[PDB]
Subunit: 440 residues, 4 copies
């Protein structure tokens, strides 16, 4: 009910225009006082801010915009801080994907040796974001972080800053039930699923469209066509997410207990992913020539006074799900979202420091995670491997240990051998000088 | 959208006219096809049914009322079963309280040896209620059980019938929240608290009115006056002098242990000395409700049969009916209401065993309860729950395995019982007084 | 092997003449270079030391005796320190038992409010003994502590000094094993039992003499005459009859039947006064008769399997003999249904590097609930020592079974604070 | 008392060795009769010939009995030493052939080959237990040292929890033999702390006569591995594979510097180096056909003709002595501290209860008393948890007759790089093990 200072950490992001409009679509419920754009790359944010200035003009010209690179200005009296940083940028992302494919391992943004490399670049910058809000922001601030790797960052931030008023979320589960809703002619607001596992490492146990269970109806379709549908093709315009949503067919057919997350293709079938990818045109290269080009081109058109199509960025359930989390934090709406919380008994046969991705009711005081219970053996063993992998990686950043990171690389299902882990690790240390913590 | 068949298991209860009116007040949200009153005592239920018909005639005359003692006719195609049975009746309640006071122990309805005795009378009759609904009722039935002892029956029903579509609740925390509403001059709708422990064995960690945390302000008042305010005296529950003494005893407990606001029933566990002296062997609490709540509900039955006018607002008091109807209503429309229910732990409270039936906040869905991950509790409250959970656990094993030694272990474990020697003299006294109600113990 | 420096922490104890002789009997295995007596009451230690040298020269007059009160003197290059201290002495034990009987509670040395009060006196003096040896003693020293209350001391010292080279034992399980052997006509060295629980809070699950299990024959006799045989003890016949699974520890007569003990105890003549005018007075009169040249009987102190059990643990630490004993150890999964920081009393193999406890497994519900209550009771009392909290000490008093209510617990704790000023830590 | 000793699997190549090491303790083991039981009648009698001349040269007063009847061999049996290899030494070859056909490691106990070998031995082991509970002495003991000990011990405990069985393995003792040869220490004075699964553990501390030598061993093993100069003289180092396995541990000990690794970690941590090293037309299972199995059938033919046999070629290795010491400890209650396989149940706190871990324990006359070792670090918890789930899912596939549980188990295994490869390996193992594997719907 109070005027709120909304701060976007990483204003120069390609998702910034879409986030703002989805935040402006909920104006009558979120009392925006000042919309702040914060970033460490000034000239990059200035170009993206010109689109935000046009998104504000076309949707709500009364919203006051603020752009800065000083953390004191951006975070002083900050009420809600939606974090979406990419440490190193997309240029460092293709470096992670090239080194992995050079050694024959999968090169992904969040999975495999690439995601582990991206993680240790984001651990300490995220903690610095925590300390910024603890010093300057409101005493009851909130950091709705959806920057990747969510599994490693949430595990690192919980062990380093346990008292941080933070909520780590991901939209990949929301994107899957967006596909699941179209398979059934169901509307996305009427969908709801039970879920467990780590980030990019979970399963849909039960699905229901408006209270009526559905899991069997979806299981039959996904095992035959995957998460694609005849209406899905109308994000599905991207020729790479059509491969991911289709790849869920073989996984859901071999293991028939639950409906799988699309990120299981990189762990269950890494040999097929390696042959599918191309080191000369990695996914990061595909978005530099795609999403990032179309947002720089739109910034140049605004400078040239030419009309821009602002609906390029108003796509996906990405922005809608994040604003709902903020909206539930403001009015205590008790929204049930698949968020990432410390376990501490939520899943009994898992460790306490494990950051599981489970359903929880978003209160104004934080997430109230639902007690899930015990999980089967096949899913405990997979999570125990990744949880130890992520845990050894965090401990490598805390202790500045080379062996701890080497142990974490060997633990990953992507890395096939202890010898490959050492050769992959030594290449990342060379390519992350100035980003990674120094290992001894 | 679907017409529902609501069955009140135990229609001859003193709370039956209350919850019937509280159920009729939600007529737009609960589509009542028929209202069924089931009981094993035909004559007692027919007298209460006279008042239920008078309540129906006053609030909603379009609701058809069916009264029966046949379980197959009562539970066939049943949609929602609200259990409020008292195995042995108030007759056995005064005998449990008198036997305890005869041995210098706290004789309470649900706490101490009287509660454990009342529990063993209710285990198998509750299981028979479950098998009735599994066999006769709808495949999506729900048993909103609020019969006591809710702690023992929930742990027993979960072990014997784990697949039962049952939800065990209690109004004692809600009644405490009503007092906290009066102390703060806050509306009960705006109240919400964090809570953990067992039934009649819990603690309020945080309490907030309209989202604003008011725990520190409440414990300031409770430490000096207890759960009693000057506006609390105006309501109907605080008319009973036993409830005034019961709420005002929380001042000592909230002053010695300053972490949380205690549940009211800690009066008998933490202070059995001050309770054995306060109670009267010749006028126990069960005797008081016989000369009070039970007397005034069978008087109104005779007044109805004599044409004299009956004051129906006698039984419309308390948050008893309002809380139980809200649970069923949240089961029908999937309202996701956050209530303090009794669920199997299974990691909800990490320091406790899996089969511990803890009383924690949960969201009532049309599929059951989704309990929130409470986490770890400090040492002083773990050790207290570990003792009672072992006590209640050994008592459930005594009913299943028919073991006399497990029952002696259950009585020895309880905090009310001072020694194992008193536990045997009390147990053997309960064996004879409950011949016909208890399971055989070899 | 190496000539070792044996130190007795508490030379003014009434047990010192017995421990010394039991240690001299194993002189062929324990290479003693000099026997030390450490204490803080040099007036009391010098009188008991007169009995020691007379025990020395009547058993082995070639070992060197040393009597000092300087902590650096006694613990420098010390290889084995045998702690038997009693903080407050026997003059405060009588006050712990009188205060409990003032409120109608169990007035015992180690069980109830008397035990918790005694435990709060021994925590920090024990920590100081640890820090004395960590800097002055040998880097592989071993502290064999058997000073009560072992349950509260072992839990407090393990949380405060986790890396302490300490072994907490108790002869009460061995004394029961002695009376068991007398029932079965068995040699004490041939008896061996499986055991679990807290110190003075455990049970005998299986007992065997010469390999043959004799549990059923024992509990037949113990249910009739208790642990007493034809060749406190007799009270265990009721406990073994009401609960038929295991053979109980004798100390369960205070927790399972507290009010029955209160009717048996006389406040004007407590147990601590029986030893004042009994064991303690026979030690000082013996030292008095030694000072006057009167011939003394040194065999009156040689009684008991008390000293022989503690020497056996030390000998097993020296030569790595793998002696299986009932030792108080940190749980950490030895009993699954108990917390990690629970100090369980389970059989373990005494090695040259410490005790290797056997994995016991899960215990049934009735014994878990009783242990969980006492473990939380002792855990809260230890937290009251570290955090200096009056509410934590009140919580621990309320948790104890022998306390009828929290009302009596507050009146009981307040009386203990009045009588233990100078021994207890501050409680805000 | 007089004891009836039964060797389950008399046709084994280790039968003459364990008989020699059993007769060396004839004063500590009162042997009433020595029984050789097996299902292969023709194979056992040939191996029984060597056993007849072993007893002739050592203690000709021992009564020898051969049979193929379980009621004859197991009635009144006091101690049974499990030694079976169901399917034979040639089904082992096809395990190591199919694995290398898909580019995976082909090992007797590790990878898809060991999981396949395990599924063959689960129900035969359950039948051996039910044979003894029904026929043998009421206080019988089964000293099981037949592989895969990890999967068998987990399956036998979940199916027969009250079985009087003790699962052991000489691999830690074979390493302890090598460690003793590096430090000029005697094997009787060696003693080590150890945790993990069977062929999946780590040596945390090592002592020679009670003095820690772990840092001194790490200095040598990180350079030459478990290979030393005195080790070469031993008969096991004359095999070219057992030298490559003991020197391969140099890298694993150099990368993970916490503990000394079990030599079987080369198959889990290095599936690239092993598949490159293995020859598909001459696997380890083939090297024992024309190697160990040829030297024992040569000796069996030498006896029936009259030619005197050299029996000391079967009298090498810590395998037999370590097994006889365990059974001797059960008879006289010697409390021998051995590295055995027991149900966890809190022994390793941060592991599941049904996990069968390999930890030190004191062998009494009533079973093994394992020591409480506590929690293990994160890197070693995650590795064991993955293998524990792998072996757990494989045991469930045997009990529940589920094809999906088997596919889940083959996918969890570290040596299998993909679910696609896990499905292709499982389908080939099903066809090759028809009649040995249970049905998988
Ligand atoms: N979890 C999910 O479901 C999900 C979905 C989409 C995007 N994301 C995350 O969104 C982020 C942005 O993606 P993008 O394609 O727009 O990236 P981008 O590289 O185009 O932009 C990232 C922005 O972050 C800024 N930044 C970098 N380090 C920073 C720091 N320490 N503090 C503040 N700002 C910093 C950069 O300067 C840049 O402006 C990534 O972390 C991505 O993984 C996550
Ligand atoms: N959960 C709580 O906090 C809470 C609050 C109020 C009441 N209660 C419980 O409500 C119940 C009723 O209280 P009351 O004072 O109105 O009781 P009451 O004695 O006046 O009436 C109880 C009724 O139950 C019937 N009954 C007994 N055994 C039965 C069986 N096996 N099947 C069906 N009906 C059976 C009796 O015949 C009688 O009609 C008690 O169990 C009481 O403890 C619980
Ligand atoms: N656990 C068992 O099985 C077992 C058996 C018998 C006795 N005990 C305990 O062992 C101890 C034996 O002593 P006792 O009963 O003969 O009493 P005691 O009073 O005769 O001797 C205790 C000695 O401890 C000394 N002391 C006090 N504070 C000290 C400190 N800080 N450092 C060193 N010495 C200190 C005293 O001055 C005195 O000399 C007592 O605590 C007794 O209860 C335990
Ligand atoms: N400590 C260890 O872990 C260790 C050490 C050495 C050998 N082993 C195991 O020893 C076993 C034997 O090795 P080997 O090379 O001598 O084998 P082998 O092939 O030479 O002999 C195995 C014998 O088992 C018999 N057999 C098969 N099924 C049987 C059944 N159901 N009951 C009884 N006997 C049966 C066969 O007929 C054959 O005679 C293998 O399982 C091997 O892995 C393990
Ligand atoms: O019947 P009474 O003794 O008045 O009890 C009144 C009731 O108060 C609350 O509702 C408690 O939760 C019940 O357990 C109790 O029965
Ligand atoms: O001191 P007493 O009354 O003689 O007690 C006899 C001794 O035996 C008990 O078992 C305790 O271990 C000692 O604390 C006690 O001193
Ligand atoms: O490869 P092989 O010659 O058959 O020997 C293999 C054997 O050697 C190791 O030392 C292990 O102790 C055994 O478990 C294994 O089966
Ligand atoms: Mn994501
Ligand atoms: Mn109640
Ligand atoms: Mn003692
Ligand atoms: Mn082996």
């Amino acid at each position: 009910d109070k005027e709120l200072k909304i701060v976007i950490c990483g204003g120069g992001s390609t998702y910034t225009p879409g986030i703002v409009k989805d935040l402006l679509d909920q104006r009558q419920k979120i009392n925006i006082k000042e919309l702040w754009l914060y970033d460490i790359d000034e000239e990059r944010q200035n170009k993206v801010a010109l689109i935000v200035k046009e998104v504000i003009k076309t949707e709500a010209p009364e919203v006051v915009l603020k752009v800065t690179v000083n953390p004191k200005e951006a975070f002083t009296d900050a009420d809600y801080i939606m974090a979406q940083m990419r440490v190193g940028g997309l240029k460092m992302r293709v470096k992670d994907e090239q080194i992995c494919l050079k050694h024959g391992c999968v090169g992904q943004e969040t999975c495999g040796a690439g995601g582990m490399t991206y993680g240790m670049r984001t651990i300490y910058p995220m903690v610095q974001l925590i300390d910024y809000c603890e010093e300057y922001a409101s005493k009851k601030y909130w950091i709705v972080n959806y920057s990747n790797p969510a599994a490693i960052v949430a595990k690192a931030t919980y062990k380093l800053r346990p008292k941080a008023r933070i909520i780590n979320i991901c939209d990949m589960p929301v994107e899957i039930e967006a596909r699941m809703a179209e398979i059934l002619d169901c509307k996305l607001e009427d969908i709801e699923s039970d879920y467990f596992g780590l980030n990019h490492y979970g399963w849909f146990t039960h699905v229901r469209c408006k209270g009526v269970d559905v899991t069997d109806k979806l299981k039959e379709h996904v095992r035959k066509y995957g998460y694609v549908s005849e209406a899905s093709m109308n994000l599905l315009k991207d020729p790479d997410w059509v491969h991911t949503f289709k790849n869920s067919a073989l996984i859901s057919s071999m293991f028939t207990d639950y409906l799988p997350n699309t990120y299981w293709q990189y762990y269950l079938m890494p040999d097929s992913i390696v042959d599918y990818m191309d080191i000369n045109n990695t996914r990061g290269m595909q978005v530099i020539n795609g999403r990032e080009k179309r947002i720089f081109k739109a910034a140049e058109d605004i400078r040239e006074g030419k009309p821009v199509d602002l609906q390029q960025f108003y796509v996906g359930v990405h922005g809608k799900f994040i604003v709902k989390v903020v909206e539930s934090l403001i009015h205590d709406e008790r929204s049930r979202q698949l968020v990432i919380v410390p376990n501490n008994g939520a899943i009994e046969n898992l460790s306490d420091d494990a950051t599981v991705e489970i359903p929880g009711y978003v209160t104004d005081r934080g997430v109230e995670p639902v007690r899930v219970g015990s999980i089967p053996r096949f899913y405990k063993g997979l999570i125990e491997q990744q949880d130890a992998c992520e845990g050894l990686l965090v401990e490598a950043a805390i202790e500045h240990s080379y062996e701890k990171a080497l142990m974490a690389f060997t633990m990953n299902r992507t890395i096939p051998s202890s010898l490959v882990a050492k050769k992959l690790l030594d290449d990342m240390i060379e390519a992350n000088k100035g980003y990674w913590p120094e290992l001894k």
